[PDB]
């Protein structure tokens, strides 16, 4: 006969809506990762995800996971290199990385390079720009003395 | 470059490309191991990783060795110590050892498979997944569709 479906203990970083003391035959729920996650089954992303009881007390879907946001490698810059302030190599949500230009030849133009990883996927700068810096040439700079 | 997406590149984009027009006749996962200049040809020896389809070449298999080609005007160049996915039509030459070779041209499709900390961003995540799983869908069951 009808029973409770088991109890939809929320996936790491996620919460569930709506919260019920038992999920009963028909009874749904929706998982919301908090500001800076996104939705994923496996590998492949999750637009949303909404599960419901059926009969026998099983689910539709199975738990989902909420992944931290991956802005992925930094874009390289023309005649410039990249430096993780947050640590080796870390491209996830709210690290910080610092573009500089090959010093002495060139200067910096537009911003000043510091870039911090987004909630949407891309790299931001201070202003609040997602595209790269630009390096401009140092004129002069003879070696006479 | 990996996963990009031409302006008139809609969804299913490889699976026309490999199945309609041209209508691919090969399909290779191949690392490029060295190039060597010849005569208004730009020679480049791969490796096979992979075989999604193929035709007249019989017997080719993952370790097995391939020689393609490219025009000296064509502004395409594959690096060496880079995994690619090429696919088109058999060509009508034969290399040292009696296996065929192939040319690149205007009907092979030629793309750099994603890297592994590229593949899991947030943005590429979602075409990471349509790339593999039309390798997948192709390298089992071909055009059969």
């Known amino acids: ?3 409770a479906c088991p109890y939809p203990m929320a996936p790491p970083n996620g919460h569930v809506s709506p919260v019920q003391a038992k999920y009963i035959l028909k009874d749904s729920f929706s998982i919301f990762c908090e500001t800076g996650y996104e939705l994923l089954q496996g590998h492949l992303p999750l637009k949303s995800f909404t599960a ?3 009969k026998d007390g099983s689910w539709d879907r199975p738990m989902p996971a909420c992944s931290i946001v991956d802005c992925g490698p930094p874009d390289d810059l023309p005649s410039g290199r990249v430096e993780y302030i947050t640590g080796p190599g870390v491209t996830t949500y709210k690290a910080v990385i610092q ?3 090959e010093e002495t030849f060139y200067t910096m133009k537009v911003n000043d390079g510091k870039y911090v990883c987004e909630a949407d996927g891309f790299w931001t700068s201070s202003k609040g720009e997602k595209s790269l810096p630009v390096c401009e040439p140092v004129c002069g700079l003879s070696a006479r003395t | 470059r990996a996963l990009e ?3 008139q590149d809609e969804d299913g984009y490889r699976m026309k490309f490999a199945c309609y027009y041209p ?3 090969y399909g290779f996962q191949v690392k490029v191991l060295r190039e060597d200049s010849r ?3 730009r020679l480049f020896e791969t490796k096979i990783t992979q075989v999604l389809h193929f035709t007249k070449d019989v017997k080719a298999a993952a370790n097995q060795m391939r020689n393609f080609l490219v025009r000296a005007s064509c502004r395409l160049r594959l690096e060496p110590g880079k995994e690619y996915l090429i696919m088109g039509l058999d060509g009508a030459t034969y290399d040292l050892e009696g296996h065929p070779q192939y040319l ?3 009907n092979s499709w030629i793309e750099e498979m994603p890297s592994e900390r590229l593949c899991r961003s947030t943005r590429q995540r979602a075409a990471c997944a349509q790339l593999n799983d039309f390798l997948q869908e192709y390298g089992t069951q071909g055009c059969q569709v």
């Open chain 1, 1 to 3: 006969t009808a029973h």
């Open chain 1, 52 to 54: 419901v009881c059926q």
């Open chain 1, 99 to 101: 573009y500089s230009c």
């Open chain 2, 5 to 7: 997406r031409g302006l």
């Open chain 2, 23 to 25: 209508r691919v006749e």
């Open chain 2, 39 to 41: 005569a208004a040809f």
């Open chain 2, 104 to 106: 690149l041209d205007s």
